[PDB]
């Protein structure tokens, strides 16, 4: 059982290395998750310098093990029974009328510290649309994610639709394909339909001179 590496705080490592339009970056992320409360709370920097997108287009790239998945929906966590070998994320995102990202990550147990370690490669973006012009707004509308099963792939997949305000007013789109398989061949769980429910609030270190993202989040699974 996978869900037995869950069982207290598990310290997080994120490591993500961008590219969009050719502005090469790089983000690295620490923090801690606690999927008994279904609870994350992780600060990330850009180590490049200015990050050359707004940080919340990469929320949902920037741990879907860490949600509290209620006793009676236990069977239903394939993210935990892929752990400790992991599994590998994919996503397209299209952010309407700009550019789109396609991203691709291992999220996996390295000794005791669980990482996510993500390539990220954005093209066809506007060099002054909402995200390369930082016309979003820091904060965060968060979405339901219908998990269904991907027998083909054994795995998961979901489609799902993230709005981002714009600064003085607006909504920027951003339509998310996800699909994730397993690392290792053991066998995993095999989901039902069911959702996601995660609630997210960015924040700012006053003392962090670097570009940066505090980032807490509850999140949950909910049956039918």
Same mark, same amino acid.
């Given at each position: 059982?996978?869900?037995? *590496?869950?069982? !207290?705080?598990? =310290?997080?490592?994120?490591? *993500?290395?961008?590219?969009?339009?050719?502005?090469?970056? /790089?983000?690295?992320?620490?923090?801690?998750?606690?999927?008994?409360?279904?609870?994350?709370?992780?600060?990330?920097?850009?180590?490049? $310098?200015?990050? =050359?997108? @707004?940080?919340?287009?990469?929320?949902?790239?920037?741990?879907?093990?860490? /949600?509290?998945? =209620?006793?009676?929906?236990?069977?239903?966590?394939?993210?935990? /029974?892929?752990? @400790?070998?992991?599994?590998?994320?994919?996503?397209?995102?299209?952010?309407?009328?700009?550019?789109?990202?396609?991203?691709?990550?291992?999220?996996?147990?390295?000794?005791?510290?669980?990482?996510?370690?993500?390539? *990220?490669? !954005?093209?066809?973006?506007?060099?002054? !649309?909402?995200?390369? !012009?930082?016309?979003?707004?820091?904060?965060?509308?968060?979405?339901?994610?219908?998990?269904?099963?991907?027998?083909?792939?054994?795995?998961?997949?979901?489609?799902?639709?993230?709005?981002?305000?714009?600064?003085?007013?607006?909504?920027?789109?951003?339509?998310?394909?996800?699909?994730?398989?397993?690392?290792?061949? $053991?066998?995993? *769980?095999?989901?039902?339909?069911?959702?996601?429910?995660?609630? /997210?609030?960015?924040?700012?270190?006053?003392?962090?001179?670097?570009?940066?993202?505090?980032?807490?989040?509850?999140?949950?699974?909910?049956?039918?």
């Amino acid at each position: 059982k996978g869900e037995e *590496l869950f069982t !207290g705080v598990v =310290p997080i490592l994120v490591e *993500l290395d961008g590219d969009v339009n050719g502005h090469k970056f /790089s983000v690295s992320g620490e923090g801690e998750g606690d999927a008994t409360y279904g609870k994350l709370t992780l600060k990330f920097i850009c180590t490049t $310098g200015k990050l =050359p997108v @707004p940080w919340p287009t990469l929320v949902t790239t920037l741990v879907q093990c860490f /949600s509290r998945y =209620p006793d009676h929906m236990k069977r239903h966590d394939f993210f935990k /029974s892929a752990m @400790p070998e992991g599994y590998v994320q994919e996503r397209t995102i299209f952010f309407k009328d700009d550019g789109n990202y396609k991203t691709r990550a291992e999220v996996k147990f390295e000794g005791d510290t669980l990482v996510n370690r993500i390539e *990220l490669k !954005g093209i066809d973006f506007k060099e002054d !649309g909402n995200i390369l !012009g930082h016309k979003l707004e820091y904060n965060y509308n968060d979405h339901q994610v219908y998990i269904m099963a991907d027998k083909q792939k054994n795995g998961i997949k979901a489609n799902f639709k993230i709005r981002h305000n714009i600064e003085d007013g607006g909504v920027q789109l951003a339509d998310h394909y996800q699909q994730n398989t397993p690392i290792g061949d $053991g066998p995993v *769980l095999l989901p039902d339909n069911h959702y996601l429910f995660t609630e /997210s609030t960015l924040s700012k270190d006053p003392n962090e001179k670097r570009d940066h993202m505090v980032l807490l989040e509850d999140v949950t699974a909910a049956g039918i």
